[PDB]
Structures are given as structure tokens and as C-alpha cells.
Design an enzyme around this catalytic site. Structure first.
Site, PDB file in Angstrom:
ATOM      1  N   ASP A 193       0.864  -1.183   0.000  1.00 38.17           N
ATOM      2  CA  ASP A 193       0.000   0.000   0.000  1.00 38.17           C
ATOM      3  C   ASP A 193       0.908   1.244   0.000  1.00 38.17           C
ATOM      4  O   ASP A 193       0.842   2.118   0.883  1.00 38.17           O
ATOM      5  CB  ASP A 193      -0.836  -0.046   1.284  1.00 38.17           C
ATOM      6  CG  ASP A 193      -2.059   0.799   1.233  1.00 38.17           C
ATOM      7  OD1 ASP A 193      -2.348   1.458   0.219  1.00 38.17           O
ATOM      8  OD2 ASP A 193      -2.728   0.824   2.234  1.00 38.17           O
ATOM      9  N   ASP A 212       2.477   1.568   8.009  1.00 35.74           N
ATOM     10  CA  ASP A 212       1.347   0.747   7.581  1.00 35.74           C
ATOM     11  C   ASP A 212       1.722  -0.349   6.587  1.00 35.74           C
ATOM     12  O   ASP A 212       1.408  -0.294   5.420  1.00 35.74           O
ATOM     13  CB  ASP A 212       0.219   1.593   7.042  1.00 35.74           C
ATOM     14  CG  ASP A 212      -1.053   0.813   6.863  1.00 35.74           C
ATOM     15  OD1 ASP A 212      -1.104  -0.409   7.164  1.00 35.74           O
ATOM     16  OD2 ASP A 212      -2.106   1.460   6.516  1.00 35.74           O
TER      17      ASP A 212
HETATM   18  N1  LIG Z   1       3.665  10.483  12.075  1.00 36.66           N
HETATM   19  C1  LIG Z   1       3.194   9.236  12.142  1.00 36.66           C
HETATM   20  N2  LIG Z   1       1.927   8.980  11.846  1.00 36.66           N
HETATM   21  C2  LIG Z   1       1.607   7.709  12.001  1.00 36.66           C
HETATM   22  C3  LIG Z   1       2.378   6.706  12.421  1.00 36.66           C
HETATM   23  N3  LIG Z   1       1.678   5.504  12.463  1.00 36.66           N
HETATM   24  C4  LIG Z   1       0.483   5.838  12.048  1.00 36.66           C
HETATM   25  N4  LIG Z   1       0.407   7.182  11.731  1.00 36.66           N
HETATM   26  C5  LIG Z   1      -0.788   7.912  11.302  1.00 36.66           C
HETATM   27  O1  LIG Z   1      -1.901   7.089  11.576  1.00 36.66           O
HETATM   28  C6  LIG Z   1      -2.666   6.850  10.378  1.00 36.66           C
HETATM   29  C7  LIG Z   1      -3.215   5.452  10.473  1.00 36.66           C
HETATM   30  O2  LIG Z   1      -2.081   4.596  10.545  1.00 36.66           O
HETATM   31  P1  LIG Z   1      -2.075   3.279   9.591  1.00 36.66           P
HETATM   32  O3  LIG Z   1      -1.026   2.189   9.965  1.00 36.66           O
HETATM   33  O4  LIG Z   1      -1.860   3.792   8.204  1.00 36.66           O
HETATM   34  O5  LIG Z   1      -3.424   2.453   9.757  1.00 36.66           O
HETATM   35  P2  LIG Z   1      -4.712   2.215   8.831  1.00 36.66           P
HETATM   36  O6  LIG Z   1      -4.574   2.520   7.405  1.00 36.66           O
HETATM   37  O7  LIG Z   1      -5.855   3.400   9.196  1.00 36.66           O
HETATM   38  N5  LIG Z   1      -5.363   0.782   9.233  1.00 36.66           N
HETATM   39  P3  LIG Z   1      -5.381  -0.730   8.620  1.00 36.66           P
HETATM   40  O8  LIG Z   1      -3.797  -0.936   8.410  1.00 36.66           O
HETATM   41  O9  LIG Z   1      -5.891  -1.653   9.861  1.00 36.66           O
HETATM   42  O10 LIG Z   1      -6.246  -0.727   7.443  1.00 36.66           O
HETATM   43  C8  LIG Z   1      -1.652   7.056   9.274  1.00 36.66           C
HETATM   44  O11 LIG Z   1      -2.253   7.383   8.034  1.00 36.66           O
HETATM   45  C9  LIG Z   1      -0.873   8.252   9.811  1.00 36.66           C
HETATM   46  O12 LIG Z   1      -1.696   9.386   9.599  1.00 36.66           O
HETATM   47  C10 LIG Z   1       3.680   6.946  12.711  1.00 36.66           C
HETATM   48  O13 LIG Z   1       4.498   6.114  13.008  1.00 36.66           O
HETATM   49  N6  LIG Z   1       4.054   8.265  12.538  1.00 36.66           N
HETATM   50 MG   LIG Z   2      -3.399  -0.328   6.711  1.00 29.57          MG
HETATM   51 MG   LIG Z   3      -2.681   3.574   6.326  1.00 32.01          MG
END
Ligand SMILES: Nc1nc2c(ncn2[C@@H]2O[C@H](COP(=O)(O)OP(=O)(O)NP(=O)(O)O)[C@@H](O)[C@H]2O)c(=O)[nH]1
Ligand SMILES: [Mg+2]
Ligand SMILES: [Mg+2]
Ligand SMILES: [Cl-]
Length: 298
Positions: A193, A212
Site C-alpha cells: 500500500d 502501515d
Molecule cells: N507520524 C506518524 N503517523 C503515524 C504513524 N503511524 C500511524 N500514523 C498515522 O496514523 C494513520 C493510520 O495509521 P495506519 O497504519 O496507516 O493504519 P490504517 O490505514 O488506518 N489501518 P489498517 O492498516 O488496519 O487498514 C496514518 O495514516 C498516519 O496518519 C507513525 O508512526 N508516525
Molecule cells: Mg493499513
Molecule cells: Mg494507512
């Protein structure tokens, strides 16, 4: 807003014994997950029961494998807290600091800053794609076969109630799936992704972090270029992905673009299938409508 946060504060402190939540806020939201920034320091990703009943397990195994085997200055999530069960999964890790890449930021970068970012991305992908993946070999993903199984589900559920235009779009996609060779090339561990929203920049606009890996797996090498090749408002542009592909080397750029184009054509069908599997009519309707928008654009 106040209530989710309280429930999740409670769950974090219940499952992670000495963890104290002094602050917590929602930092993002998938369709069946929520992410929280806790103590201005930790990301906690959470999910309740969904169709991928082994979802945070694989993601965790991938973080573990990558933190063990990658040699890179690029940071990825390093999982310190995890709770995995059928009904609830939570992953916690220190927030990687930086600014998410956007089209707007890119356009303020000098030519040389742009080139260095593309080189960083190419280098990261070359390194991940080159890892021996024996130790995570259960994380295979066969996109062609998944599509075939999703089409069978359609046939078994709503296909007969679709209109002729919808059915033709689906069949026309299936014909293309059956003629393409782009699923027959190199397999490797891909982020899967890999787009602007998951790429973090440091104060010099270099790549500092990637987040992610929730859909990561062993899959076609082409997967990781699909969003870098996308022409849309949320991504940088086709030029960007092409240049990255040239820097990465040893890959057929025309097939990467064909792979991207097939995944893009699949998207309405993917949306309908998501709706069937998760009993959400709204997605079934959005996908079917999207088929009409795509059919009438030309
Ligand atoms: N700055 C920063 N933002 C983070 C970090 N981890 C997550 N985020 C923020 O949190 C949001 C959601 O994290 P993410 O792993 O992408 O999870 P997801 O897409 O919503 N969920 P799924 O993987 O279960 O479908 C990200 O788009 C980003 O905005 C990090 O390590 N640093
Ligand atoms: Mg995700
Ligand atoms: Mg994400
Ligand atoms: Cl509908």
C-alpha cells in the site's frame, strides 16, 4: 469523539499492565480500524472483529521480520505492545516523526531534492524486495487467485441481480485478467500500500519513515509501484513512478503500468465485494455507480 478515546484508554491500560495513558487522541481511521496517538509518543492501532481474522498477527510478523533483516536508515514501526485475539487486536509502537509526503510538498522541492527522494524510495524498495523471505513465507498473497475467488462469491450472491452494464464491466475485466501476463513475474515481499500517505519526510525532505505494512506480503514485485504510478490528486504523478522505476532498475516499466491499470479497473468490483463480505450495502451501491461513471467517461 470523547467516548472512543475513553474506551481505548481503558483497553490499553487493561491489556498492557504498567502502561499509563496521560493523553490520547485519534490520529487516523480506516474503515474498520482506528489509530491513536498516546502520550505524544506512541501510535496504537486497533481493530475489532473483521473478515481478516489473522490481520494484526501478520502485520506484526512483518514488522518483526523487517526490523530483524533490513539494513536501512529508514524507520518503520517497531512493535512494543501487542494484543491479538479474534475480537480485538491492538499494536503499539513509537511514533515515527516527520511530515507525510504530499503533492504540494513535492512541488516546492528543488529538482535535486526530488531526485534524492526518488532515490531513497527506489533504494528502500530494492532492499525490501531483495530480502530472502523464507522466514515470513506464510504471508503469500496471490492477487489473481483472490480475484477469481471474489468473482465466484459475486456469482454466488448478487451477480444475477446486476444490470447488463455492470455485468459487462465485470466480464470485460475477467477477460483481461485471463489474457494478462503481469501476474507471472517475480514475487517478493512488498509493502502493498505504498503511497504518499505512508511516506514520512525529515526536515531536509528526505525519506525518513514508512508506515502501515498492514497489507504487506509476498506478491508481485509490480505491486509496490501502483500508487507511485497513479495520476490523481492524492499522488504525485506518473512521472514520479516512472523515474523511480528507472532508478530501481531491472523491471519492465510497461508491465508495471499494465499492473497498475488492471488494479485500477478492478477497484469498483473490489468495492462491491467489500460490501458483500462485510454486509455493507453502501459499498455495493458505490461500486455499481462507479461502474457507470467509468463506462460513460468515454
Ligand atoms: N507520524 C506518524 N503517523 C503515524 C504513524 N503511524 C500511524 N500514523 C498515522 O496514523 C494513520 C493510520 O495509521 P495506519 O497504519 O496507516 O493504519 P490504517 O490505514 O488506518 N489501518 P489498517 O492498516 O488496519 O487498514 C496514518 O495514516 C498516519 O496518519 C507513525 O508512526 N508516525
Ligand atoms: Mg493499513
Ligand atoms: Mg494507512
Ligand atoms: Cl446496490
Amino acid at each position: 469523539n470523547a467516548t472512543n478515546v475513553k474506551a481505548m484508554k481503558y483497553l490499553i491500560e487493561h491489556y498492557f499492565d504498567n502502561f499509563k495513558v496521560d493523553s490520547i487522541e485519534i490520529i487516523g481511521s480506516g474503515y474498520d480500524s482506528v489509530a491513536y496517538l498516546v502520550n505524544n509518543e506512541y501510535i496504537f492501532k486497533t481493530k475489532f472483529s473483521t473478515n481478516k481474522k489473522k490481520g494484526y498477527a501478520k502485520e506484526k510478523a512483518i514488522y518483526n521480520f523487517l526490523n530483524t533483516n533490513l539494513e536501512t536508515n529508514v524507520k518503520i514501526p517497531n512493535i512494543e505492545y501487542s494484543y491479538i485475539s479474534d475480537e480485538l487486536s491492538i499494536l503499539g509502537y513509537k511514533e515515527i516523526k516527520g511530515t507525510f509526503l504530499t503533492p504540494e510538498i513535492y512541488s516546492t522541492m528543488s529538482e535535486e531534492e526530488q531526485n534524492l527522494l526518488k532515490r531513497d524510495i527506489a533504494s528502500f524498495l530494492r532492499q525490501m524486495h531483495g530480502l530472502d523471505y523464507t522466514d515470513i513465507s506464510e504471508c503469500t498473497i496471490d492477487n489473481k487467485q483472490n480475484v477469481l475467488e471474489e468473482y465466484i462469491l459475486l456469482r454466488e450472491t448478487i451477480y444475477n441481480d446486476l444490470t447488463d452494464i455492470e455485468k459487462d464491466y465485470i466480464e470485460s475485466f475477467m477477460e483481461r485478467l485471463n489474457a494478462t501476463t503481469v501476474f507471472e513475474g517475480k514475487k517478493c515481499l512488498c509493502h502493498n500500500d505504498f503511497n504518499c500517505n505512508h511516506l514520512l519526510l525529515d526536515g531536509n525532505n528526505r525519506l525518513t519513515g514508512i508506515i502501515d505494512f498492514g497489507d504487506s506480503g509476498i506478491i508481485d514485485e509490480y505491486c509496490d509501484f501502483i500508487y507511485l504510478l497513479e495520476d490523481s490528486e492524492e499522488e504525485i504523478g506518473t512521472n514520479f513512478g516512472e523515474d523511480i522505476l528507472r532508478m530501481y532498475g531491472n523491471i519492465d516499466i510497461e508491465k508495471a503500468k499494465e499492473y497498475q491499470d488492471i488494479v485500477e479497473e478492478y477497484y469498483p468490483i473490489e468495492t462491491i465485494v467489500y460490501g458483500i463480505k462485510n454486509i455493507k450495502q453502501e459499498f455495493i451501491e458505490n461500486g455499481r455507480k462507479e461502474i457507470y461513471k467509468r463506462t460513460y467517461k468515454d
